[PDB]
Design a protein around this ligand. Structure first.
Ligand SMILES: [Zn+2]
Length: 76
Protein backbone atom coordinates (compact mmCIF):
# COMPACT_ATOMS: atom_id res chain seq x y z
CA UNK A 1 0.00 0.00 0.00
CA UNK A 2 1.22 3.64 -0.18
CA UNK A 3 1.63 6.31 2.45
CA UNK A 4 3.46 9.60 2.31
CA UNK A 5 5.00 11.34 5.31
CA UNK A 6 6.51 14.82 5.48
CA UNK A 7 9.14 15.72 8.06
CA UNK A 8 10.36 19.21 8.83
CA UNK A 9 14.07 18.65 9.37
CA UNK A 10 17.46 19.96 8.39
CA UNK A 11 18.90 16.42 8.55
CA UNK A 12 18.59 13.88 5.75
CA UNK A 13 17.55 10.82 7.77
CA UNK A 14 14.30 10.60 9.79
CA UNK A 15 14.04 8.07 12.66
CA UNK A 16 10.62 6.54 12.04
CA UNK A 17 11.07 3.76 14.61
CA UNK A 18 11.82 1.18 11.97
CA UNK A 19 15.15 0.04 10.55
CA UNK A 20 16.09 0.32 6.91
CA UNK A 21 18.74 -0.67 4.42
CA UNK A 22 19.57 1.67 1.59
CA UNK A 23 19.96 -0.04 -1.79
CA UNK A 24 20.10 2.80 -4.32
CA UNK A 25 19.72 6.44 -5.28
CA UNK A 26 18.25 8.33 -8.22
CA UNK A 27 18.58 11.96 -9.24
CA UNK A 28 15.71 14.31 -8.47
CA UNK A 29 14.66 17.08 -10.83
CA UNK A 30 14.90 20.45 -9.04
CA UNK A 31 16.80 19.30 -5.92
CA UNK A 32 20.54 19.16 -5.24
CA UNK A 33 20.12 15.81 -3.48
CA UNK A 34 19.19 12.39 -4.62
CA UNK A 35 16.22 10.25 -3.75
CA UNK A 36 17.32 7.37 -1.56
CA UNK A 37 15.70 3.96 -1.83
CA UNK A 38 15.40 1.64 1.17
CA UNK A 39 13.93 -1.72 2.16
CA UNK A 40 12.81 -2.52 5.69
CA UNK A 41 15.63 -4.45 7.46
CA UNK A 42 13.29 -6.92 9.21
CA UNK A 43 13.62 -10.44 7.80
CA UNK A 44 10.90 -11.22 5.27
CA UNK A 45 9.22 -7.81 5.55
CA UNK A 46 7.84 -6.45 2.25
CA UNK A 47 8.04 -2.78 3.14
CA UNK A 48 10.07 -0.32 1.09
CA UNK A 49 10.41 3.45 1.17
CA UNK A 50 12.15 6.25 -0.64
CA UNK A 51 13.23 9.63 0.71
CA UNK A 52 13.85 12.93 -0.99
CA UNK A 53 14.15 16.56 0.06
CA UNK A 54 11.38 18.76 -1.30
CA UNK A 55 12.04 21.38 -3.97
CA UNK A 56 8.77 23.12 -3.10
CA UNK A 57 9.66 23.70 0.53
CA UNK A 58 13.24 22.64 1.20
CA UNK A 59 12.66 22.38 4.96
CA UNK A 60 10.79 19.15 4.19
CA UNK A 61 11.86 15.59 3.71
CA UNK A 62 9.31 13.58 1.76
CA UNK A 63 9.11 9.90 2.55
CA UNK A 64 7.00 7.51 0.47
CA UNK A 65 6.30 4.11 1.99
CA UNK A 66 4.97 1.04 0.18
CA UNK A 67 3.71 -2.13 1.79
CA UNK A 68 2.64 -3.16 5.27
CA UNK A 69 5.11 -4.35 7.93
CA UNK A 70 4.63 -8.00 9.04
CA UNK A 71 6.20 -7.24 12.39
CA UNK A 72 6.29 -4.69 15.20
CA UNK A 73 8.67 -1.77 15.43
CA UNK A 74 12.00 -3.40 16.22
CA UNK A 75 13.47 -3.26 19.69
CA UNK A 76 16.10 -0.68 20.61
ZN1 LIG B 1 9.13 -4.04 8.11
Amino acid sequence: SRIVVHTQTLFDIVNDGYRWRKYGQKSVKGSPYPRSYYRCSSPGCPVKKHVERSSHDTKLLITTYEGKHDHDMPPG
